[PDB]
Amino acid sequence: STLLASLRDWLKAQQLDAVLLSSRQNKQPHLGISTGSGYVVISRESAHILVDSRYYVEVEARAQGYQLHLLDATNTLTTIVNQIIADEQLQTLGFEGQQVSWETAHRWQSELNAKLVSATPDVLRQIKTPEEVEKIRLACGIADRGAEHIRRFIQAGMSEREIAAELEWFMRQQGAEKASFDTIVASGWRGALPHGKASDKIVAAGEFVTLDFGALYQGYCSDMTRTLLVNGEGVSAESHLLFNVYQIVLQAQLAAISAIRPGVRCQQVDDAARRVITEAGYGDYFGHNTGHAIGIEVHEDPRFSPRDTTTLQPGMLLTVEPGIYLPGQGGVRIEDVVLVTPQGAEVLYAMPKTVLLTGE
Amino acid sequence: STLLASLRDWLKAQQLDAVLLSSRQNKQPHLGISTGSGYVVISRESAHILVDSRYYVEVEARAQGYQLHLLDATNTLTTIVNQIIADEQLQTLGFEGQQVSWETAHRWQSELNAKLVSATPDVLRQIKTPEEVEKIRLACGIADRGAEHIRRFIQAGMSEREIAAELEWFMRQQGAEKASFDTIVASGWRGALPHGKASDKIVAAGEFVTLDFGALYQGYCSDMTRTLLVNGEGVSAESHLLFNVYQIVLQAQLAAISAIRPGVRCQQVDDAARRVITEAGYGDYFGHNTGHAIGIEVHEDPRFSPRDTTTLQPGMLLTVEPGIYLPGQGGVRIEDVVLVTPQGAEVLYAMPKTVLLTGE
Ligand SMILES: C[As](C)(=O)[O-]
Ligand SMILES: C[As](C)(=O)[O-]
Ligand code: NA
Ligand SMILES: [Zn+2]
Numbered sequence: 005s006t007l008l009a010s011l012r013d014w015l016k017a018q019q020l021d022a023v024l025l026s027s028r029q030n031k032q033p034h035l036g037i038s039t040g041s042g043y044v045v046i047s048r049e050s051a052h053i054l055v056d057s058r059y060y061v062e063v064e065a066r067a068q069g070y071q072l073h074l075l076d077a078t079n080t081l082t083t084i085v086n087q088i089i090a091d092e093q094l095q096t097l098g099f100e101g102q103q104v105s106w107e108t109a110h111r112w113q114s115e116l117n118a119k120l121v122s123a124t125p126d127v128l129r130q131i132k133t134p135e136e137v138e139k140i141r142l143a144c145g146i147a148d149r150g151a152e153h154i155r156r157f158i159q160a161g162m163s164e165r166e167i168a169a170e171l172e173w174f175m176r177q178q179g180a181e182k183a184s185f186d187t188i189v190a191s192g193w194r195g196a197l198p199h200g201k202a203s204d205k206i207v208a209a210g211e212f213v214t215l216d217f218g219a220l221y222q223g224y225c226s227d228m229t230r231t232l233l234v235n236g237e238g239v240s241a242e243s244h245l246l247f248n249v250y251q252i253v254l255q256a257q258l259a260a261i262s263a264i265r266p267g268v269r270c271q272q273v274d275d276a277a278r279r280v281i282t283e284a285g286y287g288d289y290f291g292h293n294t295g296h297a298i299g300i301e302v303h304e305d306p307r308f309s310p311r312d313t314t315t316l317q318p319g320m321l322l323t324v325e326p327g328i329y330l331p332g333q334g335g336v337r338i339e340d341v342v343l344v345t346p347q348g349a350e351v352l353y354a355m356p357k358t359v360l361l362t363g364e
Numbered sequence: 365s366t367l368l369a370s371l372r373d374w375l376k377a378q379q380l381d382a383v384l385l386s387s388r389q390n391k392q393p394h395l396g397i398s399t400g401s402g403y404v405v406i407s408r409e410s411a412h413i414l415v416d417s418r419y420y421v422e423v424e425a426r427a428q429g430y431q432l433h434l435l436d437a438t439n440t441l442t443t444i445v446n447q448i449i450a451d452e453q454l455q456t457l458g459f460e461g462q463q464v465s466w467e468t469a470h471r472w473q474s475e476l477n478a479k480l481v482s483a484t485p486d487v488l489r490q491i492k493t494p495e496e497v498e499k500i501r502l503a504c505g506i507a508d509r510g511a512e513h514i515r516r517f518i519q520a521g522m523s524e525r526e527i528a529a530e531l532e533w534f535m536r537q538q539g540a541e542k543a544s545f546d547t548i549v550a551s552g553w554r555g556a557l558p559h560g561k562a563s564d565k566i567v568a569a570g571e572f573v574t575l576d577f578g579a580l581y582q583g584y585c586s587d588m589t590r591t592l593l594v595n596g597e598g599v600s601a602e603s604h605l606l607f608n609v610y611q612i613v614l615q616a617q618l619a620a621i622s623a624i625r626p627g628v629r630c631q632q633v634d635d636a637a638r639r640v641i642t643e644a645g646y647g648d649y650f651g652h653n654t655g656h657a658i659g660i661e662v663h664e665d666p667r668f669s670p671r672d673t674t675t676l677q678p679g680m681l682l683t684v685e686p687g688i689y690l691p692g693q694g695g696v697r698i699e700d701v702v703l704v705t706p707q708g709a710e711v712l713y714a715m716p717k718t719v720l721l722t723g724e
């Protein structure tokens with residue numbers, strides 16, 4: 005209803021009669037599941053769901069408000085959509101040109117009785133509805149508890165991968181469908197790798213270990229990073245080589261978060277965090293964006309980047325995750341998911357972002 | 365290398381001067397890793413790898429036989445490939461039209477100084493090399509032990525989500541990188557959902573519970589289904605509501621395996637399973653294919669489906685997974701990964717497929 009109204013408004017604004025939704029992320033709200041298979045066709049007057057025998061009985065429960073079509077040998081996308089084009093005399097038909105393969109679009113371009121136009125409805129997902137925000141909250145909540153669990157769990161001698169397995173297992177136990185992306189556990193020198201997926205490297209005492217991870221909860225994602233200190237005998241934060249670097253990052257993260265409220269454009273938030281790191285003399289060791297939107301996918305638009313001029317509004321959720329990465333020494337990243345509120349910004353993680361020790 | 369020769373034989377047969385490989389699965393044999401980023405360019409005369417700083421040092425070391433190019437701001441897909449097109453006067457360039465989006469292929473066709481032709485090298489992967497067969501053989505092993513473990517682990521009272529967490533965790537602990545796909549755990553009435561991903565539903569005594577799951581091991585996939593009987597007081601197989609249905613499924617599964625040997629068309633294997641299920645009076649509740657090939661991906665070609673006329677060859681690996689799904693009652697599926705052998709067929713799982721009780 006609200007989902008369908010929002011889509012139809014988009015159709016009119018875009019000069020389109022209907023849209024063929026094929027991407028899993030844009031099909032999920034309608035299907036109640038995330039699948040590569042199946043299609044959703046939305047017209048100004050009707051709503052259709054197309055699935056094969058593998059998903060029919062499962063979708064059928066949730067699919068109130070939709071016309072339900074079985075995909076089989078005789079009944080295909082072509083036969084079904086063409087029937088729909090006929091009944092409502094549809095002239096123009098949208099498709100996700102960034103999600104559909106050249107081959108599939110090309111067959112469509114020849115087989116579909118309408119003018120096919122590459123359009124993307126991804127922009128509608130920028131502002132979340134309360135039901136979505138709530139789902140993301142529990143995703144974020146599941147993540148938040150995982151951080152604490154994994155902090156008590158970590159022992160010098162363990163592998164980065166074991167830590168990830170344990171962390172994911174715990175998230176799963178907390179109701180997660182799975183991790184929202186391949187878990188990053190980057191200890192010691194691997195901390196210099198912003199994308200250091202958990203490896204067989206042994207975690208050692210006195211090392212920083214960066215955990216970047218997240219939960220998929222009912223089709224919505226969380227995304228968190230904490231850089232912890234692997235505890236051992238005579239280990240202290242202030243003695244660490246990268247202690248100042250840690251603080252510079254934590255500060256840059258706060259500087260970006262305090263800069264978030266409705267109305268502020270995205271590039272200014274990156275400017276906030278980046279200038280702190282840059283005037284600290286580490287501008288060249290901050291190679292990625294300050295953050296990214298999040299929702300049905302881990303990475304959505306807009307971006308906290310130097311070039312993104314998108315203006316901020318309540319209902320948006322974005323990550324704030326600056327970092328400094330020093331090849332040969334290690335690195336630090338600290339990430340929060342931030343919900344934009346009418347008043348300002350709201351952090352959905354309770355986990356402290358100071359230097360914490362593992363174990364005990 | 366045989367890999368490059370086989371590709372070059374394919375190039376010749378396809379009448380293409382070169383191919384641009386972009387999909388993670390078709391790059392993996394060349395890169396030794398699985399990434400969305402990066403490209404592999406093979407001509408009749410040369411072999412190239414294009415990766416960014418994240419993978420360059422590790423790939424450049426291992427990737428002997430290739431010309432290595434760094435991807436950065438200055439050196440891009442366009443600048444690098446166009447140089448190669450120039451140096452060897454390439455006329456035609458194949459690209460994976462089923463993996464590259466409509467938008468991306470359009471951009472490439474204009475930015476690249478050659479005629480791009482949608483071609484797909486996926487067929488070279490149908491027959492596995494002894495190295496590949498072994499890796500899959502071991503991937504299957506991890507799943508096989510996981511099934512044995514999870515069967516003893518399951519107790520009435522657990523949720524499907526909980527059972528999945530343990531099964532996934534155990535696979536990791538057994539050396540798996542991760543699950544090859546989202547784990548299906550469908551107990552009682554949810555057993556009527558062929559893709560019923562593990563939910564919060566409690567598994568109850570006397571329920572059938574279907575576990576469909578798999579491991580990603582060394583870049584290759586396993587895929588297994590077992591339907592177990594949840595143990596409880598006075599619970600017995602023969603008394604179960606779906607016992608006959610279970611037996612019909614098991615029978616159809618064996619009949620399909622028995623049909624597998626070099627020379628047989630894939631549709632004939634499907635015919636074997638479907639005829640058993642159909643003659644039993646349950647054809648209308650067996651809506652999906654009998655199986656699929658598996659390798660770098662969980663789903664590959666050919667398919668054990670009514671229409672696939674592909675003839676079986678030694679070194680191919682396919683699943684055999686017929687099922688019967690009864691809305692309101694439950695369902696049964698039994699899945700093996702089967703290696704086509706020189707003489708006939710070999711099942712790579714040791715787990716029994718008769719009705720097994722959980723626990724103890
Ligand atoms: C590793 As990320 C950009 O999903 O926080
Ligand atoms: C659930 As399957 C088609 O990957 O066995
Ligand atoms: Na061209
Ligand atoms: Zn993250």
Ligand SMILES: [Zn+2]
Pocket residue numbers: 227296323325339
């Ligand atoms: Zn992030």
Ligand SMILES: [Zn+2]
Pocket residue numbers: 587656683685699
């Ligand atoms: Zn399968």
Ligand SMILES: [Zn+2]
Pocket residue numbers: 576577587588589685699
């Ligand atoms: Zn399966």
